């Protein structure tokens, strides 16, 4: 069995819809739902946790004073189930704030470290869903990268654009986020790491097996 954290940006900017089209939030939710549906249908043994960042509430083991705010553990590590599908589909909504992505990653790693203690997992994995529109502190990257490698946690990113034609009007913050994603994934697995960054559209096409 594996352990997977779905680390989903639900911050305010995720709710923006281009001309009524689907917002990044709805696109990310659809990818998460297709993944969870396949896991449940197959009776997979993998355990799935869900961390949301950008929530109006704060609920996580690291939260103190003004640290790790607006990050919430929606589902601790366990088998996915029909309750989770209903919650992701019909309960989870966008927040009205932004949270720091790297703090959400730290919360996700800490959750995996704590909740896999004394258990046997083949792999530990974190999947990030975001549009990279909000700021983060680049200095804490060194510790995060080191801890990911020590813990043998692998990463995937799911975005509304490629990390490599017509430009998409990306903000300077989104471009900085792109550089951060490339830095993390390259440190973790070189050039192959960069191929673990996907668009929502590509992921939906791969995962849309129920029709």
């Amino acid at each position: 069995k594996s352990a997977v954290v779905l680390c989903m940006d639900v911050g305010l900017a995720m709710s923006h819809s281009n001309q009524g089209k689907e917002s990044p939030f709805e696109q990310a939710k659809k990818v998460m739902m297709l993944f969870l549906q396949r896991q449940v249908f197959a009776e997979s043994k993998d355990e799935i946790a869900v961390v949301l960042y950008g929530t109006d509430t704060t609920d996580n083991a690291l939260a103190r004073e003004d640290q790790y705010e607006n990050i919430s553990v929606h589902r601790h590590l366990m088998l996915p189930d029909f309750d989770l599908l209903e919650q992701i589909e019909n309960v989870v909504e966008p927040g009205s704030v932004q949270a720091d992505f790297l703090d959400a990653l730290i919360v996700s790693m800490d959750l995996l470290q704590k909740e896999t203690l004394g258990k046997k997992y083949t792999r530990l994995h974190i999947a990030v869903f975001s549009d990279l529109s909000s700021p983060f502190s680049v200095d804490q990257l060194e510790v995060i990268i080191a801890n990911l490698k020590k813990a043998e946690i692998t990463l995937q990113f799911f975005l509304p654009f490629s990390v490599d034609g017509p430009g998409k009007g990306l903000s300077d913050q989104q471009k900085e986020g792109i550089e951060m994603v490339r830095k993390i994934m390259f440190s973790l697995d070189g050039e192959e790491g960069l191929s673990e960054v996907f668009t929502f559209r590509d992921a939906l096409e791969r995962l849309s097996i129920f029709k």
Partner: peptide
């Protein structure tokens, strides 16, 4: 890999 595992 990952979610496509």
């Amino acid at each position: 890999k990952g979610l496509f595992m």
